[PDB]
Every structure is written in C-alpha cells, then in structure tokens.
Amino acid sequence: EPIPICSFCLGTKEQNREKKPEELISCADCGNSGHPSCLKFSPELTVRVKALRWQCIECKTCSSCRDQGKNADNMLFCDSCDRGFHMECCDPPLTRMPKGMWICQICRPR
Ligand SMILES: [Zn+2]
Ligand SMILES: [Zn+2]
Ligand SMILES: [Zn+2]
Ligand SMILES: [Zn+2]
Secondary structure (H helix, E strand, C coil): CCCCECCCCCCCCCCCCCCCCCCCCCCCCCCEEEECCCCCCCHHHHHCCCCCCCCCCCCCCCCCCCHHHHHHHHCECCCCCEEEECCCCCCCCCCCCCCCCCCCCCCCCC
C-alpha cells in the first residue's frame, strides 16, 4: 500500500523515466506517488507540495470552504501550491477562465 513508486514510469524516487533521482509526491489519501516531471509539476510545486499534504486529481479539494461534490470537480488547481479552489471560492472572485497559470488566494493575497 505505502509502496513509494511512480504511477507513470513505475519508478521510485531514486529513479525517474530517465534513471534520474528525484523525490516522489505521494497522495495524502491514496498514497500514490509520482515524480514532478512525470506529473508535469512546476519547480515551485515540487518544493511547495513536498512540504504540504498533497492530494491527487481524484482527492484534490477546496481550501477556502473545504467541500466536495459536483462543484469540487470544477475547482481550479493552484500552479504554486496545487491547492484546489472552487471557481466562486477564488479570492478575489473568478471572472473567467484565465488562459495560462492559475494561483490561489493563499499564494497571491488581495
Ligand atoms: Zn515517474
Ligand atoms: Zn488520492
Ligand atoms: Zn470552496
Ligand atoms: Zn496556492
């Protein structure tokens, strides 16, 4: 169950797709880990997520109100901490889908 392996390349933190050593980001609910390169994570997420309770795409929840359901599936993932936030939970309120990288209110105050 706690097997520290990658779901994309079946490799551990000691060996990546190209035998490259790098820590693995294991889901705090499923325990499934994956390399930042395999998960297409950002340099900030790699260091920002390794120090916080990370959740996979099927576990990611809202940090503002902290809820689940249909709206929880349409939330936005932070490009700085990978925290999910409902479209309406974003601070300030989300006007429209931003073409590019999104960052939660916890990472970018108002
Ligand atoms: Zn991998
Ligand atoms: Zn999970
Ligand atoms: Zn919310
Ligand atoms: Zn954030």
